[PDB]
Design a protein around this ligand. Structure first.
Ligand SMILES: CCN(CC)S(=O)(=O)c1ccc([C@@H]2CC(=O)N(C)C2)c(-c2ccc(OC)c(OC)c2)c1
Length: 125
């Protein structure tokens, strides 16, 4: 009924760090994960439990910080921009499904402000 969670490991990809990928795991993800508003985003949205039959009809690319965390831990991303896109998709999903001023949107907006501030200090290429 729920979609399978996104893949988080690539079986043939070499392990390669970059300055930016190290920053995204050790600074960006770590900071957001511990925030008091992180919990609704730490795992895929369970649209069954929340009685939202239309969520996965409206959201074509589900994404969440638990998936991002595993991807970074497993070195799934080839570059930092793929990871940044996953964060942006997560926030977009919230803003296109939920009503403005819903509590979950306020929580997303607080997390996104912290995300964008950290991205402003992303190491150079
Ligand atoms: C904690 C266990 N689970 C976590 C995924 S849960 O049961 O599925 C679950 C539990 C609670 C919430 C929020 C928190 C809050 O203040 N609400 C009014 C609902 C969400 C949720 C997250 C992101 C969304 O936007 C894309 C969203 O849109 C409906 C809902 C999910």
């Amino acid at each position: 009924s729920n979609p399978p969670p996104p893949e988080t490991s690539n079986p043939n990809k070499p392990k390669r760090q970059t300055n930016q990928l190290q920053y995204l795991l050790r600074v960006v993800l770590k900071t957001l994960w511990k925030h008091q508003f992180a919990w609704p985003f730490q795992q895929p949205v369970d649209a069954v439990k929340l009685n939202l039959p239309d969520y996965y009809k409206i959201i074509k690319t589900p994404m969440d910080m638990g998936t991002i965390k595993k991807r970074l831990e497993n070195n799934y991303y080839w570059n930092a921009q793929e990871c940044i896109q996953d964060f942006n998709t997560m926030f977009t999903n919230c803003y296109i499904y939920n009503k403005p001023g819903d509590d979950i949107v306020l929580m997303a907006e607080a997390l996104e402000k912290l995300f964008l501030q950290k991205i402003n200090e992303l190491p150079t290429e």
